[PDB]
């Protein structure tokens, strides 16, 4: 069903758990089959599970953690602040990001937008 | 001009400064004359400076602070996490919110959406 505010908080927290462990197959399954992803926002979106799996496989030694609570509305939308830590060519860096997600009538991510740019990178 | 990523960070930080001191007239001036505000997201928007000034006058002993950095893109958009502390009928409460804003070709807030619901309230 369309996730309630409480369900949206749980789903988005799970998403960060999956990104942290790096379970690409579990991440891809959270998305609707025809979902779109705009990461970083401003860049053209990728559509469908195939392109989404490719995107995550490429992106994922990475650890992610929520840096604040998940803000959720009553219409299946949520926004959350988090940090991603990686090692860019020997040198370890961090990225502060805010994801905005809209879930569908089935509890799957219909659309995801990630807000960040170089101003949010620490290398 | 269309704010750069760095300018978006500065504008959004200023916005929280204004909300914190409670300078309603300075807040209203940051918006475009025909801007829309959806606070909380899910609720119908209010349009134009008149309705926006009314909204802030009604909403504003309140203190607000950024609880993390402003995430900014290259297309005039930004997202930021913050907390608002107030006193609801004798009892002091807090609200964790995430605002997403889009600026226009003049550096004014064209649209603002606030993500939060009762799950983000501590009373």
Curated annotation (Swiss-Prot), chains A, B:
It comes from the Bacteria. Gene3D superfamilies: 3.10.450.50. Changing residue 99 to A/L: Reduces activity 100-fold. Reduces activity 10000-fold. CDD domains: ketosteroid_isomerase. Pfam families: SnoaL_2 (PF12680). Changing residue 31 to S: Reduces activity 4-fold. Induction: By steroids. Keywords: Isomerase, Lipid metabolism, Steroid metabolism. InterPro entries: Ketosteroid_isomerase (IPR039256), NTF2-like_dom_sf (IPR032710), SnoaL-like (IPR037401). Substrate binds at residue 99. It catalyses: a 3-oxo-Delta(5)-steroid = a 3-oxo-Delta(4)-steroid. GO terms for biological process: steroid metabolic process. One of its GO terms (molecular function) is steroid Delta-isomerase activity. The active site is at residues 15, 39. Homodimer. This is Steroid Delta-isomerase. The gene is ksi.
């Amino acid at each position: 069903n369309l996730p309630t505010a409480q369900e949206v908080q749980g789903l988005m927290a799970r998403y960060i758990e999956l990104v942290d462990v790096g379970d690409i197959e579990a991440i891809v399954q959270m998305y609707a089959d025809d979902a779109t992803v705009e990461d970083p926002f401003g860049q053209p979106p990728i559509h469908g599970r195939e392109q989404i799996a490719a995107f995550y496989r490429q992106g994922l030694k990475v650890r992610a953690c929520l840096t604040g609570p998940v803000r959720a509305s009553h219409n299946g939308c949520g926004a959350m602040p988090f940090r991603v830590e990686m090692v860019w060519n020997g040198q370890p860096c961090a990225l502060d990001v805010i994801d905005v997600m809209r879930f569908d009538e089935h509890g799957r991510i219909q659309t995801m937008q990630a807000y960040w740019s170089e101003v949010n990178l620490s290398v």
